[PDB]
Amino acid sequence: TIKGEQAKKQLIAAALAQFGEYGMNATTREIAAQAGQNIAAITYYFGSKEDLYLACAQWIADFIGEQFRPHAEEAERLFAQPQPDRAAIRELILRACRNMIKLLTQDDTVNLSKFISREQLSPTAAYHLVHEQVISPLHSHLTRLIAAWTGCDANDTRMILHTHALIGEILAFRLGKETILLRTGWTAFDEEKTELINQTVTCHIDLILQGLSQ
């Protein structure tokens, strides 16, 4: 039971790396070897390679959800006040963006990004599980905060597109990781360099918020 939860945790971590690189042409053999387990553990603990692929998506959704939950709760508390400040709405936008930038310049989330990025261009049931549980709630959370600050309608197609483009700036330092490392000459991100990325994206958000403001 507790022996099995450690085995399951190693299997998910190894599957995330192999699926992230190879999709469903990852092998149970290589997943099990990287996990320090026998190939039978995949069938025993998860049912099949296919079921382990979905458990990888579930793990990613749970991981993002635990990061996202406190931001949603803080926003609900702010909008419960009779007179929220526009400055406080902006601060929620920036705390969400800085938290995403931080996680997306961290080595140990790279396999999560690989797994999701593959599913963005070839979606399976895995993508829709993560989308419904957390990616859509996070996208809508940012769309509504931006609409709340600017005074626009969060459900307008244009607002959704505006927000999507902005999120692309946050994602560019992970999805364009090798491009920006070579172009800056940095061999790796560190705290000082993540702070520069924060300032860059914060600047663009402020400019776009001010331009959209009613």
Add this chain to the structure above:
Amino acid sequence: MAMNNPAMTIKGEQAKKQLIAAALAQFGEYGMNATTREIAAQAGQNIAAITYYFGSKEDLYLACAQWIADFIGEQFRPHAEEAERLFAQPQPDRAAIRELILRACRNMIKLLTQDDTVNLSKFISREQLSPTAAYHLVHEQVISPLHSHLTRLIAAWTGCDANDTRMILHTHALIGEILAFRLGKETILLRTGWTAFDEEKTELINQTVTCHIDLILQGLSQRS
């Protein structure tokens, strides 16, 4: 991974092009755990032809990278030529600089909402996160020159230093807006309710990204 000498015959060149198209699809999806059997079947050629034309699966993988570099390079050669005609000007028209930035962005967005470039995007995205010799081929030949050309245009507009770490970061963040409708394709299709892009929807995307480019250009030129 090594380069291959070019085919001596038209029929050879055509069969190699069929193999590269199929290999982009299979490598795009599966990386190096793609199979030559599935590549050959998708191409309508034989496994043995991969061996004769390319030598190995890994050499075919590098040929895919080279094809990507040539394709992007030809799409943005006219932009590069126009940028150099501007750069060599003593009195560069700020309006012309902006027009070149917006046209490059609109060309990128258009290509990145076409179905027939998805496999290219799959191939590069995996290489961004797990780079091999393939990424560095494409980077040196076209990605870095295009990235640098857009940075230099933004710097010219704003009056900043194109080699400044700041300008490189601003440019990279901006390019992420242009890539977002491909790299976040499924997210934005579901969030909008669209089942597919089309002319009209791509024009809406272009209007959105253009708006952002203008707001950022204006904001970065303050204090100049």
